[PDB]
Amino acid sequence: PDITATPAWDALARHHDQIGNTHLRQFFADDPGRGRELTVSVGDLYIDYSKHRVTRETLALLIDLARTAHLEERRDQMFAGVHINTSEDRAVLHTALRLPRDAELVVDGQDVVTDVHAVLDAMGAFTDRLRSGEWTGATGKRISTVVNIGIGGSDLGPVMVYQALRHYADAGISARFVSNVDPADLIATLADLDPATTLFIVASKTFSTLETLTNATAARRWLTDALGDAAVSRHFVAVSTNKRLVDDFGINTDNMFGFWDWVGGRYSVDSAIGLSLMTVIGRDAFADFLAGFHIIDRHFATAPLESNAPVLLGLIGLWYSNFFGAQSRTVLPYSNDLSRFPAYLQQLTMESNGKSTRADGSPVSADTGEIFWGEPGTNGQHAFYQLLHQGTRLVPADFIGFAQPLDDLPTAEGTGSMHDLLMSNFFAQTQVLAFGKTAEEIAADGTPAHVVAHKVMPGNRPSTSILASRLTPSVLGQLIALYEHQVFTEGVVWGIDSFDQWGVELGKTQAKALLPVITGAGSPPPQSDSSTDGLVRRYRTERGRAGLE
Amino acid sequence: PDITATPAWDALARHHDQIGNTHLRQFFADDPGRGRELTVSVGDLYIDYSKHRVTRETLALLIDLARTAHLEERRDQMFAGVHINTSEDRAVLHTALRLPRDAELVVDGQDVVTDVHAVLDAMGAFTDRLRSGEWTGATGKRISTVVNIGIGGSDLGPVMVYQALRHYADAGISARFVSNVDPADLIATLADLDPATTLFIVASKTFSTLETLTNATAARRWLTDALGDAAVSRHFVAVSTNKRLVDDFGINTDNMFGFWDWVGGRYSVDSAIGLSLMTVIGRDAFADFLAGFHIIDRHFATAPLESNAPVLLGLIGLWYSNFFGAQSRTVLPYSNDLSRFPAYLQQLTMESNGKSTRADGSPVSADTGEIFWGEPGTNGQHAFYQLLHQGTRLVPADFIGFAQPLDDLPTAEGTGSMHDLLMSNFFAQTQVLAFGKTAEEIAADGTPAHVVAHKVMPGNRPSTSILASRLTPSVLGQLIALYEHQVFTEGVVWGIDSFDQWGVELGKTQAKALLPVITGAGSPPPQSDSSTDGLVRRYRTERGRAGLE
C-alpha cells in the first residue's frame, strides 16, 4: 500500500509542522541527556545521532512509520531468502556471504553456506599460492602486482577496500584497478608494469561486460606480446560464473571464482569480487572483514527498533529527505585511507534507491533515494564546508572517524599527534555545524560591525558522528553493513525494490546503436533529435572523418 | 537590491508556471532547429545546451534577469580590478594571471602584468633547471619526483591538473600531493620514495597553514634524517608570500614563488600554485594552459549575452536551482584523466556561492549555490546513473567529452576504437536522459507486461554537452575558465560575494580549542553540549587515555 497515505505518515507531517523550524540549540536545551542517550554502541562503533533535528517523540513516530511498513517482517524475509527482489523474482542474500561456516541456510534447494565457503576456501588456496610464491609467472618470477578489471560493483568495492586497508597489505604485492572503457585507464595503469610479475583479475558475472572484456582483451594482448600465447593461464584469473567464456578467454577454469545471482553488484565486495583484497591482506584478514559485516547483520536482525542502528539512521535520513526536502546526504570520513568510501556509498545508495516505482510497479507518491556525495575529512573541509556552513542547502552529514591511528606523526613542534589534530577537526565541525554562531556572539569577538553579517553561522546543520575504535578489516566490514541496512530500511518504508537496476539497460543498447553512426563510412542519417544529430556531426568532423561531409 | 523582487524575476516565475512541467520531447518537437541554434562554438569547445528545459523565450527572460543584475558592468569591474570582493575590500584578479605579456593593467598602483610574468619567468627558470638536471639533490642525483604539499586551493588544482595533463608529462619527473593532516597521507605518499631524488613544493600563502606546515615539517624530518640538515635548501621550495617564514623553514628565499591577495585559493591553479604542473609539463605547455583561460576570458568579456557561453550556462543553472528547486548539479567528464575534475569544481562552485548573505550583508531571499558532484564517464554510469534515470531527483548534468583521443586501443575484435566506445556512451546517455522511453515503447519491445513499469524511463532529465576537440593544456584552461565565469554570473545575479569564505574560520578556531580537551591530562570539563561531551569522552577512553576516567 502507499506509505504516504497511512496515519503514521500524516502524524509525521503534523509533527514536522511543529518542530520543522526548531534550532538544534533548543533541541539540546530541552533535552540535556540526548548526548548520551541518542547513541548506539555496536561492535567497534560508537554512533552518536544526537545532533539531529529530532525529539524523542520524532524517533517514536519514525519508528511507527517503520512498523506500519513491516520493516521487521521484510528484514526477516531477506535473511531467510524469500524473493524480495520482486521485479526480477530473486533472492537477496549478500548477507549470506559473511555467515560463519557452521551457519544453517538452505534456499530454493541450494545450501548457500556450503557454496559460499567452498568459494572462500578456493580463494584462500589460490591466494596463499600468490603470497607465498608457489604461483609464478610465465617466466620464473613471483607476482608483485595484481590488477583488477571490472566496472561498477566489480570496481568501486575492490578499489575503496584496497585503499582503506592499505596498512594491512603484508605480502609485498600491490593492486591496481582498471574500469573505464576510456583506453587512457588501461594505458596509464600498465605503463610501468612488468608483465612477468603482473597478474590480472577479470571480474564479471557474465564475462560478457563490454568495458571489462574490452579492457581484458587489450591487457591480454599486452601480456602475450611480451610473454607469449601460452602465458595466459598463469597471468589471468576470473571472478565470473560463465565457465565457457572464461575458457576460452584462455583462463584455466579452476582459476575461476564464482558468485551467485542473489548477490547484487553493489553488494558484491564481500564475495569473490573481493579476490584482489584477499590477495594483498590474506584469507585471515579477509575473514575478519566478513566477520565485521556479520556483527552488524546480527545486530540488525536482533536489536529492537528503538536501539537498532541501521534502522534509526535510515529513518532519520528519510525524515530529512521526505519531510524537509533535503535532496542529498554527505559522508565525510576523517581518514585518507577511506578517501574512496563516499564514492562506494554512491553506488550502494543511489543505484539501490534511485527508483520511481514501488515493488508492485505502481508510481511513488513521494521522493525516494537521496543523492550521496563526499570527500575524506580535512580535504573536504577546505573544499566545500563553506557551503555546508553558510549555504542555503540542508545537507545531513555523516562524520566517520577512528579513535586510534594505525601510524602517527608528531605535530610541528615535535610533540603531540597529527592524528589528534585530525580528530580535533572531527569533533569541532559537527559542533559548529549544529549550533553555529550569532551576530551578537561575533560582535563580542571584536569584528567590525559591517563585517559581522558575513561571518554569521546560522547552524542547525545536522550530523551523525560515527567513532570507530580503529580502522581494521572488521571495522570496515561493520561500516559497509551499517550502510547496506540503512539503504534497506529506507527502501522498505518507500515500498520500492532496492535490489534491481533496470534504469541502466537503455543507455547500453542506445550506445550500441549510436556506435555505427559515429564510426561508419559516409554521413549518418537524420538522428532521433537535433541535439544528438548536431553532436554526432561535430564529433565526426573533429575525429578527422568528415572530409567530404 | 533584492533580485527576487524585480519584474525580471516575477516574469520568470510566471514563465515557469507555464512550461515547468513541459517534457523535452515536446520542447524538441516545437523547436526543430534548437540542436543547431542553442549551441556555442568557442575556442576548442563545442557547447550544446539544447537538451535543457528552455524555450527561446526562457533564454531571453533569463538574459533579462542578468541585465537587471548588471552582469556586464560587474564583469567589466572585475577585469578592471575594482574591489568587488566587498566583505574583504579587495580586487578579484585571477583573470590577470593569464594575460599576455604585452597586456596593459595597473590596479591600486600595482603593475600586475609585470608582476605576474616576473613570477612566471622565475618559475620557468627554476623548473627548466629541474627538467634538465642542472638542479640536483643533496647527493648528486637529479630530481625524479616532485611532491606538493597544500590543502584546498593549494591541492585540488595541482592534483586535478596533473592527472588531466598526464599525457604531457615529458621530462621523466612525476608528481605526488599530500593534503590531509591525517598522517596516513604523508606516510603513504613517502613510503617508496628516495629522499635523494625527491623535492618538495610547500604551497601556502601565509606559510602558517596548520595542515600544510605540519605535513611539511614532518617531510623535512624525513628528508633530513636521510640527507642531513643542510640538504633542505635543494629539496624544498615554497609557493608563498611570506619571505621570513619560508626562511627560516630552511628554504632559500629566491626559491620562493609568490602570488597575490587578489587571487583566491580556489582560483589559484594558474598562478605559482601551478608550479608542480609546470615542473612536469614545462613552461611552454604551462603557457598554453594559461592561454586557454584567456580565450574564454576574452569571450566572456566581449561576446553578447545572447551568445555568451559562461553566462548562458550560469543562467540555465540558476533556472533549475531557483525555479525548479534542483539542489545539485552533476559534472560527468568522459575521460579517466579528468577523474578529479568534479572534485575541483566542488570547491570552485560551492566555496564561491555557498552563501546566505548579499554583498551588502543583507539576507538572501532565495537559494544561492548548488551542490556540485560527479565522477568520470563510464565509471559514474555504472555507479549512480540508475538514480539519474529512474530517480525522483532533478539533477541537471554537464557531459564533458573529447573528440580526438590522445592514445587509443582497438575493441575486443582487434578493430575499431575503444575511444569510440567511450563516446558512443557520451552521446547516448544525454539522449536517453532527455527523452526516456514510455510504457508503450517498452511493451513494443516484448517485455512482460508486469515488468514494464519498472523499466519505464520518464526522461526530462536535462544536460549540457561540451565536446572539446582534444584534451590539451589549452583546452583544460578553457574548461576551468568556463566554470569560473558561470560561478561569476550566478553570484552576480544573486548579489552575493562569491570571492570570500568566512564560513571556514570558526571551524578552525574551534578545533584549536577542542585539541587540549582530547589531548590533555585529566578529565575534560563539561563541554558546550552533551554530544561533543560524550564524543570527547569516548575518544579519550578509546585512545588509551581514560584509565582513571
- For A110, the grid coordinates are 541450494
Q: How many C-beta neighbours within 10 Å does residue A26 have?
A: 11
Strands A39-42 and B106-107: unpaired
Q: Phi then psi for A506, rounded to 5 degrees?
A: -55, -40
Q: How far is CA A249 from the centre of its chain?
A: 30
Query: Across the A/B interface, how many CB contacts are shorter than 8 Å?
Result: 499
How far apart are alpha carbons A367 and A325 in whole angstroms?
8
**Among A351, A375, A484, A490, the one annotated catalytic:** A351
Interatomic CA distance for residues B66 and B3, integer angstroms: 10
Residues 217-246 of A with CB under 8 A from B: 217-218
CA distances from B271 to A365, B115, B119, B235 (A): 51, 11, 9, 21
The three grid cell numbers given for residue B481, joined into one nine-digit string: 575558465
Q: What is the separation of C-alpha B131 from the centre of its chain, rounded to a whole number of angstroms?
A: 28
What are residue B114's phi and psi, to 5 degrees? -65, -45
Identify the bridge partners of residue B378 per DSSP, sorted by sequence position.
Answer: none
Q: Look up residue A362 and give its DSSP letter.
A: P
SS3 A467: strand
Reference A113, options A95, A91, A90; nearest CA is A95
* H or E element, residue A361: none
Q: What is the dihedral of CA B296, B298, B300, B302, to 10 degrees?
A: -150
Of the residues B141, B508, B512, B549, which is catalytic?
A: B508
Q: At what angle do helices A56-68 and A71-80 cross, to 10 degrees?
A: 50
Q: What is the set of domains in chain A, with CATH numbers? A: 1-93+288-504 (3.40.50.10490), 94-287 (3.40.50.10490), 505-549 (1.10.1390.10)
Q: Which helix (DSSP H) or strand (DSSP E) does residue A354 occupy?
A: none
Calpha distance A77→A107 (Å, rounded): 12
CA angle, residues A208, A505, A156, in degrees to nearest 5? 65
Beta strands in B356-414 (DSSP E): 371-373, 397-404
Whether B66 contacts B59, CB under 8 Å: no
Distance CA A336, CA A164 (A): 8
Distance of alpha carbon B421 from alpha carbon A514, whole angstroms: 10
Cα(B338)–Cα(B330) distance, integer angstroms: 14
Gap between the Cα atoms of A367 and B436, Å rounded: 19
Lookup: cell for B202: 610547500
Spatial distance between the Cα atoms of A280 and A234, rounded to a whole number of angstroms: 18
**Nearest residue of B to residue A165, measured between CA atoms:** B184
User: Which among B535, B528, B518, B525 is positioned nearest to A41, based on CA atoms?
Assistant: B535
At a CB cut-off of 8 Å and minimum separation 6, what does A17 contact? none
Distance CA B314, CA B491 (A): 9
Rounded to the nearest angstrom, the gap between the alpha carbon of residue B183 and the centroid of all alpha carbons in its chain is 25
- Three-state SS across A249-267? HCCCHHHEECCCCCCCHHH
Q: Which residues contact A280 (CB under 8 A, 6 or more apart)?
A: A146, A162, A165, A168, A169, A170, A171, A173, A174, A175
Relative to beta strand A256-257, strand A45-48 is unpaired
Closest by CA position to B237, among listed B117, B159, B146, B116: B146
Give the method used. Answer: X-ray
Are the C-beta atoms of A76 and A297 separated by less than 8 Å? no
What are the angstrom distances between the C-alpha of B326 and each of A109, B36, B308, B323, B353?
Answer: 48, 27, 23, 8, 15
A290 neighbors A97 (Cβ within 8 angstroms): yes
The four Cα atoms B170, B174, B178, B179 give a dihedral, to 10 degrees, of 20
What residue spans of A191-282 are helical by DSSP H? 210-227, 243-249, 275-281
CA B494 to chain centre: 21
A 10 A CB-CB count for A106 gives 11
Nearest residue to A398 via CA among A458, A338, A353? A338
CB burial string B476-509: b at 16+ within 10 A, e below: bbbbbbbbbbbbbbbbbbbbbbbbbbbbbebbbe
Q: B208 and chain A: CB distance < 8 Å anywhere?
A: no
SS (H, E, C) A501-523: CHHHHHHHHHHHHHHHHHHCCCC
Return the number of other C-beta atoms located less than 10 Å from residue B13's C-beta: 12
Alpha carbon distance B546, B540 (integer Å): 6
Residue B415 makes CB contacts below 8 A (sequence gap 6+) with none
Resolution rounded to one decimal, in angstroms: 2.2
C-beta separation of A500 from A85 below 8 A = yes
Residues near A501 by Cβ (< 8 Å), separated by ≥ 6? A264, A351, B386
B188 Cβ under 8 Å from any chain A Cβ? yes
For B338, which residue in chain A has the nearest alpha carbon? Answer: A184
DSSP-derived pairing of the beta strands B328-333 and B256-257: unpaired
Helices (H), B42-174: 56-68, 71-80, 112-132, 156-164
> What single-letter DSSP state applies at residue B3?
G
HSE-CB at B230 with a 13 A cutoff on CA atoms is 2
Query: Which residues are within 8 A (CB) of A338 and not within 5 positions of it... i.e. 6 or more apart?
Result: A160, A163, A164, A376, A400, A471
DSSP string over B232-266: GGGTEEEE-S-HHHHHHHT--GGGEE---TTS-GG
Instruction: Tell me the C-alpha distance between B280 and B109, whole Å.
Output: 35
> The dihedral of CA B404, B406, B410, B411: what is its sign?
negative
If one counts every other C-beta atom within 10 angstroms of the C-beta of residue A546, the result is 13
Q: Which three cell numbers stand for residue B464?
A: 549540457
Quickly count helices (H) and strands (E) in chain A. Answer: 22, 13
Contact between A91 and A108 (Cβ < 8 Å): yes
Do A467 and A401 meet the contact criterion of CB atoms below 8 Å apart?
A: yes
Query: Which residues of chain B does A35 touch, with a Cβ-Cβ cutoff of 8 Å?
Result: 529-534
The sign of the CA dihedral B28, B29, B35, B36 is negative
Identify the CA nearest to A159 among candidates A214, A206, A201, A110.
A201
Query: How many C-beta neighbours within 10 Å does residue B409 have?
Result: 23
- Asked if A82 has any chain B CB less than 8 Å from its own CB, the reply is no
In angstroms, the CA A317 to CA A313 distance is 6
Q: Which three cell numbers mark A356?
A: 520511481
| B350, amino acid identity | M
**Which candidate, B538, B510, B312, places its Cα nearest to that of A425?**
B510
Local structure of A11: helix, strand or coil: helix
Residue A414, sorted as left (phi over 0), alpha (psi -120 to 50) or beta, turns out to be left
Q: Which amino acid is at A515?
A: L
A22 touches B502 (CB < 8 A): no
For residue B536 the three cell numbers come to 570527547
Q: Which residue(s) pair with B147 in the sheet?
A: B176, B200
Q: Give the number of other CB atoms < 10 A from CB of residue B304.
A: 9
- Assess whether B419 carries a catalytic annotation: no
Cα angle A26, A27, A30 (rounded to 5 degrees) comes to: 80
Contacts of A452 (CB under 8 A, 6+ apart): A439, A442, A443, B361
Residues with Cβ within 8 Å of A404's Cβ and at least 6 positions away in sequence, in order, are: A469, A470, B542, B543, B544
From the list A269, A271, A284, A268, the residue with the least C-alpha distance to A168 is A284
Residue B262: CB atoms within 10 A of its CB come to 22
Q: Is A124 on the interface with B (CB under 8 A)?
A: no
Judge: B420–A362 Cβ closer than 8 Å, yes or no: no
Q: For cell 560551492, name the residue.
A: B350
Which of A480, A492, A42 is closest to A298 using CA atoms? A42
Closest by Cα among B421, B22, B401, B450 to A502: B450
Q: Are B181 and B214 in contact (CB under 8 A)?
A: yes
Which DSSP state fits A94? G
CB neighbours of residue A140 within 10 Å? 7
SS3 A33: coil
Instruction: Return the SS3 of B5.
Output: helix
Is residue A211 within 8 Å of residue A151, measured between CB atoms?
yes
The alpha-carbon gap from A370 to the nearest alpha carbon of chain B, in Å, equals 8
> For residues A532 and A525, what is the distance between their CA atoms, to the nearest angstrom?
12
> How many Å separate Cα A383 from the centre of its chain?
22
Instruction: Give CA B474 to chain center in angstroms.
Output: 16
User: B338: which chain A residues are within 8 Å (Cβ-Cβ)?
Assistant: none
Question: Of B391, B395, B458, B382, whose CA–CA distance to B425 is shortest?
Answer: B382
Rounded CA gap, B54 and B62, in Å?
A: 10
Spatial separation of the C-alpha atoms in residues A273 and A277, rounded to whole Å = 9
Rounded CA separation B205/B240 (Å): 4
Q: Do A530 and B335 touch (CB under 8 A)?
A: no
CB B450 within 8 A of CB A361: yes
Answer whether B546 touches A (CB < 8 Å).
Answer: no
Characterize the bridge pairing of strands A328-333 and A397-404.
Answer: parallel
d(CA A285, CA A298) in angstroms, rounded, equals: 20
Name the burial class of residue B443, with classes exposed (0-12), middle (13-18) and buried (19+) by CB atoms within 10 angstroms of its CB. middle
The C-alpha cell at A276 is: 584482489
Contact in structure between A395 and A538 (CB atoms under 8 Å): no
> What is the 8-class DSSP label of residue B329?
E
In sequence order, what are the residues at sequence separation of 6 or more whose Cβ sits closer than 8 angstroms to the Cβ of residue A420?
Answer: B515, B518, B519
Q: Which of B46, B334, B512 sits opposite A538 (nearest CB)?
A: B46
Quick check: A313 and A47 in contact, CB under 8 A?
Answer: yes
The residue among A525, A213, A182 whose CA lies nearest residue B404 is: A182
Angle between helices B56-68 and B7-19 (to 10 degrees): 160
Question: Which of chain A's residues have a Cβ under 8 Å away from the Cβ of B524?
Answer: none
Cα of B156 to nearest chain A Cα, Å? 8
Characterize the bridge pairing of strands B39-42 and B45-48.
antiparallel
Contact A226, A218 (CB under 8 A): no
Test B355 with A166 for CB contact under 8 angstroms.
no
Q: A57, A141, A167, A508: which one is catalytic?
A: A508
Beta strands in B291-414 (DSSP E): 328-333, 371-373, 397-404
